[PDB]
Structure formats: structure tokens, C-alpha cells
RNA sequence: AUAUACCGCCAUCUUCAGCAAACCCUAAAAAGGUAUUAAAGUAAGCAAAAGAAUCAAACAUAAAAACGUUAGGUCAAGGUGUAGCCA
């Protein structure tokens, strides 16, 4: 089972006809949906990296 | 006033701890009535008890 | 345990020149790098006249005896700050020496800000950088003026935050707010390269001394 | 300026749900329809009667579950069956919901002469899409 | 009709009439009320009892059935709810203590609490904040015509030598209080107190057009100063001092001038170091006994300080006039409450 | 009766680019805060933008358009505060 099959399954099981596709149901990998968090720029002592 | 509002407070010559509060610790002068806000009746009574 | 930590941090302050920074420079070395050359008399600041040896046909000359004394103190302070693991930020707005000063900070292991200084960088650090940002413990101003011939904003803003400042001050600058002023030439490439070398050798010596001091005292604890 | 179904800006302290945040021009684009029947399809009859039932069914549920509705209800008609899907806050005890479900279903099945079912999804508190 | 009935949120929105041209025109007033406050689900005027909604579903092991309260029982319940309404209404009526400042209707001299915590949980509970002026300034704008801002001057202090002031401006008074209160904690002067109760020496200064003449006083003298100076002195911790303010009574210039003078005074220890001599004190209540209050840190000198036959000091007529026997004003040294 | 108590739903500037919140700076601040070979401004929200619609594509047209201004329009869509009529 792959990402392509997932998108097809969700479209069958949750039919949505909204024109904007960002507003449709999605079961995507957390990396795709969650924005990359910029890592902390300093350590425990507080000295920037 | 401070004395009248509290009925348990008693102006007596033997109650020195109360009397001390109405005398200047540095100069030993009895405060005038406006200073502590006591009424004139109790100020006279305090002055006699301190004396 | 507690004795060892006290030894590491309190022993260095019982010696006048714990890091032997005196050897790094000499009046002769400074004179080779043209550290005694100042701006014309017209450009002179009133608070620089103490440090000026005289006027050689319109060009103020900087007494290299006062420079040597002040430079000794400034390097000594910069070493103890580096020894105690403090953050040191190099600051300059001269674009001829922007790459050299950024390269020095990287060599030392410290920080450089040679670009446009944002208003509020230090007085509004939490908003700009984050809630727990640790500010610099020392700012070294290789140049104390910006490119419009006005004091660098970080001189006043570093005093507001009570951060000590080691700055190179020339005959047209205002040393009043610099904690450790170093009177000297700020324009010549040979003068700036000498100062950059001194601050880099000084900082590296202080960091190395800390490692050795920790190893000796640490070894004693088992031994 | 357009004032229709637009929850206007305040000072960033007004919680709004997903339904409230989107203005009318986002209908069929970002947000769907709360009621789904076949009466507005082309060549279909009884739009007026389905629409009147919706108005009443919404006023009935607000009064029958006063202060317990987290969002607007969703009405779903299939054949003669009516299905009411309501997000309800967890304010009332559990047994009270069983009473109001039995009452509201039987009463609306004998009023419109159709099988009516109530579907309740309980939320701990209103879901806030954004603070405006 | 049942179809022309609107919700409570929409009914109060119109009736209250908060939004509208009236608000910008400065227009007691009606108060919103919650009508579902005391209503219990399942309770009606008719008094029916619904098992599982407004009464126990099972009672003493008996499955309850529908019922209705008698006319007498329902009348009691109706009257009881009417009583509960009165109790809740009374709560709003109550008005409780606050402390006035210099005057009952003014904010000057009013404590507004400590500044807010710092970035790393740095609490300032030991600091107190006092208001020194609240002003409603105006800026003309094309969009709004006259627009109003609240300019607040506050002072902070821990009563132990550390104090500061700031100005906060906002459109809302509550916001201006927060801005000034947290800004002033960033401008903390440390004020030197002689023995913790007074200034080290007389201080005379002019800040812009405001003149201040402070005088060092003995214990028990109390604060005899401008009400603002009394407020600041308590924040600093000064207990005994005299001050006079003349010229302009600008509150900002008085606060800036006060802190300027109090922070540029000279402690006895400093004076001994500058001149190298001992600083000795002579009290009339201790007789001729010499009291040494500060000794030079380094080397004690041996050259006596020059004592001129006639000093060239610049004297203030106000100070001297009293000792010359000139009658004072009727307003001078009146009996006042303890400060 | 009062749109000069309001909700609701709009007009106008307007397809204008701002608005407001939290901060920071000023030899005091009523207010102001930009310079890119950069000189005290910063980082989030709303609007614009983007996206969606006119069933490939673009462009275009629609739609959208904040805070305010005109006590702008509407008590006669409906509702409603206050006052008024109840043979
Ligand atoms: K209106
Ligand atoms: Mg130069
Ligand atoms: Mg009054
Ligand atoms: Mg109008
Ligand atoms: Mg138009
Ligand atoms: Mg498109
Ligand atoms: Mg747009
Ligand atoms: Mg009109
Ligand atoms: Mg009209």
C-alpha cells in the first residue's frame, strides 16, 4: 500500500466535491502536512550554534 | 478614630504598650491629635494616661 | 569538588597577567602596523585629545604608550571573559574589513555581526531571537562608527543592557561609553589585521588554558 | 461593504469555528452544505417543503438541547429517513442525553410522519478554527 | 409566529445597541442578562415531572412515571426561583473597598500592584507601583477627528533604595497602566539613603523650569514634601526629609528632576575618598562626642582642609529668610496626618 | 413616533492600501520611528496577494475588498430598546 493508493481510497470513502483541494479530506504522511520545525539555534549553555 | 473603632483598646496608664505608640520614640514628644487621627476626647485621655 | 570549581574560576584573578598577553604585542609591533596614524585635526573628537601624542603637519598622531597600556587591559579582560566561557561578539560596519572580521570570529570560535544592525537587537532580544536567547557577554567594536560617520547603535544599546565593550577608538570617535577603549588606527588594513590577530590569539589561549586547568584539577579528584 | 454571514474582525480575541470563519462566497469551495436533500436538484419537486422542515428542525434542536450545541446541526435526508447529526457539548449528564434523544426522535417522527434518528457526537468544548 | 423568533444573542445585540453611530457619539445604560442562568432543563411553568430529565429516574428502587406537581407545590417552586433571582441580582449591587490616592476621584497616588513577571519567571512581588499622573491627550486625525490616548506616569520601588519611573501611553487606561508599570522596572535607579531613613545631604536643583530644594532631616521628622515626592519617597524608602517645589509643577519634570538629584548625591564614604580625610559627625543630642561616619579607604591625609574665614557659598533667600526672623506664611508647618 | 437607540442587509470612497494587537527606541514622548554601498525599529493577525469559479491552457471577466468616512439607506422584509393607542 502506497501514498497513491491512500489518496484514492480516501477519495472513495470520503467523497468531497469542494473546488479547492486543500479543503478536502486528507490522510497524508506527517512530514508532508506538518511544516519543518526550525531547530533550536543554541544549546543548553545558551551559546548559539 | 483608631481608638474608638476598636472597643477592646483601652487608654489606661498601665497599658504602656498602647501608650508608647502615641509617643515619639526618638524625641519622646506626644503626637498631636491630627498626627494619629484620634479624636480630641481620646487625645486628652491619652495625654493624661501618658503623663 | 567545590574546592576545585573555586580553584578554576577564582585562581585566575589572583595574577596580574594570568594569560601572559603582554608578549603578544609591543610598541614596536604596533608602530609597524601604523596603529599610531589618526585622522586630520579637523576630524578630531574632543574626548580623544588625551590619547593623541600630537599633530604632525595636520595628521594627529596617537600615543602608542597609552595605546599599549590600554590594549593590555582590553586584551586581559577579553581573555578572562573567554576563559569563563562567555560569549564574545565582534561588531564592525566597515565593509572593506567585513570578511576579515567574520573570518576572525569563526577562527576564535566566537560571533560576528558585521551587517546592518537591526534596531532592538539587544533591547528587544527576546522578541527578535526567542524567549531564552542568551545575549553576548562582551562586544568587541573593531569599528565604533557606522557608514554615516555616527556612533554604531550597539555602543549605546550595549550600555543600556550593561554589556562591557572593548572598542578600537580613533581620533574622530567617542570613547566615553566604551568600557575598555583601545586608542589606535581603525582605517589601515595593517592595523585592523594586527588587532584581529591579537583578539584571536588571546581568545584561543584563554580557551586552551581553561581546558588545561580543568584537566589538572579534575585529575586531582581521583588522584 | 458586505455584512452577510461574515463574523467581523475584533482584536484577535474572538474564537470562531470553521463554519463561522468562511464567508458566503466560500460555500462549495472551502465549506459544504449543512443540509443535503434532493429537492434543489434539476427537475425535482418539494424544495419549499424540505426547506421549511429544515428551519423548524434547527429551531427545535436549539431549544431541546439549550446551550449544549457546539456547532450547527447537519441534516441528511435519505429516502423518507431523516438523520440529524449534531455536535453537542458534554455539559449534561449522560442519562439526560438518552432521554432527550428518545423524546426528540419520537416527537419528530410523529410530526413529519417519517423515521427520524438523532446522531450525537460529544465534544469536550467548542472547537476553535482561528482567533479573529 | 414560531418562525419570526430570534435567538438570545441576536436579541441582546440589537437591544443593547452597543454597535452603531451612538458609540462614537459617546452614547445608566441597559445591562445584558442571561435568561438561561437559573433554568433547569426539564422544568416548565406547568410543573410536569419527567423521569430522567428533571427528577430521579428511579426512586427507592421504583421506576418512576410521569407526574405533575400540585398548584401549591408549583407556586412554591416558582417563588423559590424568584428568590434565587434576587440573590444573584444583589451580588452585582455590592460595591467594595478600594483606596483613594491624593483625592477620591483621581488616580494619583493609587497603588496598582507589582510589575508583571519577567522572561525567566523573575517575579517582582517586592516592588510596588504608584500612579503619579493620568492624562487624556488628544491627536487630531482625518479618519477619526479627535482621537484620545491615555498617558500614564507611574513610579515603582521596593522601599529599600531601588526605584524607577516610566510613561505608558495607550488608547485604553488598563493598557497604559501595564505599559508604564513594566517599562519602569527597566529604569531602576538606586538611591543612597543615610542610615536608611534620609538623604546624605541637602540637594538643590533645577530641572527645566521646576525647582526642587530637599533638606536632610533627623529621625522622626517625617516626610514633609509635595504629595508626589511623598509617594516616591515611600517607594525609595526615605522616611524623614523636607522638600519644596517651585516654578512649574509639571509632574514629569518633577519626577525626572527628583531622580536626577537623588541619584547624583554623594555618600560620606565617597567624600572621605575624594578628599582623603575623616568624615566626622557632631550631634547636639550627643554633646561634643565626635562620631566618625566614614574613613578614607586608602591613605589618610595630613593637610587640614582649608577653612575660609568667610565662605563664598551661594545662599537661598528662602532658607535664610526664616533665620532672619521674618514671619512665615499661615500655611507653614500646619498640623497634618502622619506620613 | 424616533433609522439621531439598534440588529439584520447594503450604498459610497473602493480593487483605495491600509487597519489594529504585543513590543522596542527618544537629553521627553502633544507625538515620532525611513535611508539596501542602509542611519531604530521588530515579530504575529486582518485586508491585498495567492487560491478557487467561468468544467485543458493562459489572459480576461466575475467574485473578493480590512479599519474607517457620510448620526448615509431601510422601525414598511423580519426582529427589537424607549414612548404611545387598547369601544
Ligand atoms: K444599520
Ligand atoms: Mg579612522
Ligand atoms: Mg469623593
Ligand atoms: Mg444611519
Ligand atoms: Mg463599487
Ligand atoms: Mg483559476
Ligand atoms: Mg483577492
Ligand atoms: Mg440620517
Ligand atoms: Mg430618510
From Swiss-Prot, chain A:
Annotated compartments: Mitochondrion
Domain of life: Eukaryota
SUBUNIT field: Component of the mitochondrial ribosome small subunit (28S) which comprises a 12S rRNA and about 30 distinct proteins.
Family the UniProt entry places it in: Belongs to the universal ribosomal protein uS9 family.
Protein's recorded name: Small ribosomal subunit protein uS9m
Gene: Mrps9
Entire-sequence positions represented here: 99 to 147 of 390
From Swiss-Prot, chain C:
Record's keyword annotation contains NADP: no
Leader sequence residues: none
GO molecular function annotation: structural constituent of ribosome
Gene Ontology cellular component annotations, sorted alphabetically: mitochondrial inner membrane; mitochondrial small ribosomal subunit; mitochondrion
Keywords: Mitochondrion, Ribonucleoprotein, Ribosomal protein
Domain of life: Eukaryota
Intracellular or extracellular location(s): Mitochondrion
Protein family: Belongs to the universal ribosomal protein uS2 family.
Subunit-structure text: Component of the mitochondrial ribosome small subunit (28S) which comprises a 12S rRNA and about 30 distinct proteins.
Stated name of the protein: Small ribosomal subunit protein uS2m
UniProt source species: Mus musculus
Gene (UniProt): Mrps2
UniProtKB/Swiss-Prot annotation, chain D:
GO biological process: mitochondrial translation
Subcellular location: Mitochondrion
Highest taxon in the source lineage: Eukaryota
Protein name per the record: Small ribosomal subunit protein uS3m
Gene that encodes it: Mrps24
Lineage: Eukaryota, Metazoa, Chordata, Craniata, Vertebrata
Full protein stretch here: 36 to 167 of 167
Molecular function GO labels: structural constituent of ribosome
Keywords: Mitochondrion, Ribonucleoprotein, Ribosomal protein, Transit peptide
Quaternary context: Component of the mitochondrial ribosome small subunit (28S) which comprises a 12S rRNA and about 30 distinct proteins.
GO cellular component: mitochondrial inner membrane; mitochondrial small ribosomal subunit; mitochondrion
UniProtKB/Swiss-Prot annotation, chain E:
UniProt-annotated location(s): Mitochondrion
Swiss-Prot/TrEMBL keywords: Mitochondrion, Ribonucleoprotein, Ribosomal protein
Primary location recorded for the protein, binned into one broad class: mitochondrion
Residue span, S5 DRBM domain: 127-191
GO biological process: mitochondrial translation
CC annotations in GO: mitochondrial inner membrane; mitochondrial small ribosomal subunit; mitochondrion
Amino acid composition bias (Basic residues), ranges on this chain: 24-34
Region ranges (Disordered): 21-37
Family that this chain belongs to: Belongs to the universal ribosomal protein uS5 family.
Subunit comment: Component of the mitochondrial ribosome small subunit (28S) which comprises a 12S rRNA and about 30 distinct proteins.
Name of the protein in its database record: Small ribosomal subunit protein uS5m
Organism: Mus musculus (Mouse)
Gene: Mrps5
Portion of the full sequence shown: 90 to 432 of 432
Amino acid at each position: 500500500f502506497a501514498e497513491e493508493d491512500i489518496d484514492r481510497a480516501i477519495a472513495y470513502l470520503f467523497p468531497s466535491g469542494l473546488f479547492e483541494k486543500r479543503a478536502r479530506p486528507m490522510m497524508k504522511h506527517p512530514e508532508h502536512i506538518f511544516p519543518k520545525q526550525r531547530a533550536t539555534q543554541w544549546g543548553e549553555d545558551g551559546r548559539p550554534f | 478614630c483608631p481608638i474608638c473603632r476598636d472597643h477592646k483598646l483601652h487608654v489606661d496608664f498601665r497599658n504602656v504598650k498602647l501608650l508608647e505608640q502615641f509617643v515619639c520614640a526618638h524625641t519622646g514628644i506626644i503626637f498631636h491629635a491630627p498626627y494619629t487621627g484620634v479624636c480630641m476626647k481620646q487625645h486628652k485621655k491619652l495625654t493624661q494616661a501618658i503623663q | 569538588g567545590d574546592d576545585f570549581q573555586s580553584r578554576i574560576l577564582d585562581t585566575p584573578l589572583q595574577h596580574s597577567d594570568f594569560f601572559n598577553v603582554k608578549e603578544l604585542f609591543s610598541v614596536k609591533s604596533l608602530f609597524e602596523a601604523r596603529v599610531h596614524l589618526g585622522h586630520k585635526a579637523g576630524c578630531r573628537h574632543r574626548f580623544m585629545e588625551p590619547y593623541i601624542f600630537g599633530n604632525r603637519l595636520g595628521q594627529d598622531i596617537i600615543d602608542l604608550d597609552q595605546t599599549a597600556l590600554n590594549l593590555q587591559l582590553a586584551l586581559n579582560f577579553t581573555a578572562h571573559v573567554a576563559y569563563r566561557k562567555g560569549i564574545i561578539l565582534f561588531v564592525s560596519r566597515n565593509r572593506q574589513f567585513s570578511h576579515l572580521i567574520e573570518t576572525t570570529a569563526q577562527a576564535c570560535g566566537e560571533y560576528a555581526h558585521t551587517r546592518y544592525f537591526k534596531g532592538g537587537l539587544l533591547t528587544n532580544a527576546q522578541l527578535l531571537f526567542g524567549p531564552s536567547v542568551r545575549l553576548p557577554d562582551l562586544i568587541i567594536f573593531l569599528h565604533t562608527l557606522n557608514n554615516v560617520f555616527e556612533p554604531h547603535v550597539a555602543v549605546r544599546d550595549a550600555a543600556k543592557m550593561n554589556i562591557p565593550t572593548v572598542g578600537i577608538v580613533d581620533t574622530n570617535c567617542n570613547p566615553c561609553l566604551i568600557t575598555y577603549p583601545i586608542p589606535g588606527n581603525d582605517d589601515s588594513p595593517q592595523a585592523i589585521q594586527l588587532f584581529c590577530k591579537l583578539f584571536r590569539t588571546t581568545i584561543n589561549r584563554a580557551k586552551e588554558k581553561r581546558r588545561q586547568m580543568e584537566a589538572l584539577h579534575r585529575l586531582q579528584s581521583p588522584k | 461593504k458586505n455584512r452577510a454571514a461574515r463574523v467581523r474582525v475584533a482584536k484577535g480575541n474572538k474564537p470562531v469555528s470553521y463554519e463561522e470563519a468562511h464567508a458566503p462566497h466560500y460555500i462549495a469551495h472551502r465549506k459544504g452544505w449543512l443540509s443535503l436533500h434532493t429537492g434543489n436538484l434539476d427537475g425535482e419537486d418539494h424544495a419549499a417543503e424540505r426547506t421549511l422542515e429544515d428551519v423548524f428542525l434547527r429551531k427545535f434542536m436549539m431549544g431541546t438541547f439549550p446551550g449544549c450545541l457546539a456547532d450547527q446541526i447537519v441534516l441528511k435526508r435519505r429516502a423518507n429517513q431523516v438523520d440529524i447529526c449534531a455536535l453537542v457539548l458534554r455539559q449534561l449528564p449522560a442519562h439526560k442525553f438518552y432521554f432527550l434523544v428518545g423524546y426528540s426522535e419520537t416527537l419528530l417522527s410523529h410530526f413529519y410522519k417519517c423515521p427520524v434518528r438523532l446522531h450525537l457526537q460529544t465534544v469536550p468544548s467548542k472547537v476553535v478554527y482561528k482567533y479573529i | 409566529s414560531f418562525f419570526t423568533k430570534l435567538t438570545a444573542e441576536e436579541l441582546w445585540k440589537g437591544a443593547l445597541a452597543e454597535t452603531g453611530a451612538g458609540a462614537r457619539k459617546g452614547r445608566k445604560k441597559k445591562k445584558r442578562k442571561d435568561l438561561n442562568r437559573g433554568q433547569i432543563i426539564g422544568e416548565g411553568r406547568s410543573g410536569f415531572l419527567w423521569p430522567g430529565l428533571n427528577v430521579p429516574l428511579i426512586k427507592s428502587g421504583v421506576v418512576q412515571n410521569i407526574g405533575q406537581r400540585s398548584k401549591e407545590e408549583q407556586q412554591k417552586v416558582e417563588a423559590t426561583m424568584v428568590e434565587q433571582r434576587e440573590e444573584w441580582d444583589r451580588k452585582r449591587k455590592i460595591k467594595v473597598k478600594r483606596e483613594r490616592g491624593w483625592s477620591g476621584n483621581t488616580w494619583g497616588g493609587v497603588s496598582i500592584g507589582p510589575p508583571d513577571p519577567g522572561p525567566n519567571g523573575e517575579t517582582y512581588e517586592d516592588f510596588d507601583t504608584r500612579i503619579l499622573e493620568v492624562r487624556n491627550v488628544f491627536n487630531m486625525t482625518a479618519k477619526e477627528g479627535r482621537k484620545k490616548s491615555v498617558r500614564v506616569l507611574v513610579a515603582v520601588g521596593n522601599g529599600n533604595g531601588a526605584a524607577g519611573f516610566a510613561i505608558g501611553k495607550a488608547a485604553d487606561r488598563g493598557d497604559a497602566f501595564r505599559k508604564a508599570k513594566n517599562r519602569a522596572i527597566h529604569y531602576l535607579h538606586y538611591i543612597e539613603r543615610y542610615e536608611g531613613h534620609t538623604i546624605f545631604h541637602d540637594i538643590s536643583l533645577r530641572f527645566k523650569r521646576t525647582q526642587i530644594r530637599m533638606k536632610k532631616q533627623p529621625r522622626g521628622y517625617g516626610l514633609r514634601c509635595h504629595r508626589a515626592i511623598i509617594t516616591i519617597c515611600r517607594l525609595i524608602g526615605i522616611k524623614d526629609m523636607y522638600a519644596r517645589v517651585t516654578g512649574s509643577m509639571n509632574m514629569l519634570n518633577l519626577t525626572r528632576g527628583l531622580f536626577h538629584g537623588l541619584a547624583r548625591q554623594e555618600t560620606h564614604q565617597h567624600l572621605a575618598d575624594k578628599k582623603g580625610l575623616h568624615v566626622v559627625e557632631f550631634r547636639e543630642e550627643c554633646g561634643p562626642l565626635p562620631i566618625v561616619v566614614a574613613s578614607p579607604h586608602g591613605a589618610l591625609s595630613k593637610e587640614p582642609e582649608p577653612e575660609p574665614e568667610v565662605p563664598d557659598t551661594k545662599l537661598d533667600w528662602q532658607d535664610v529668610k526664616a533665620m532672619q526672623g521674618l514671619k512665615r506664611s499661615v500655611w507653614f508647618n500646619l498640623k497634618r496626618p502622619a506620613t
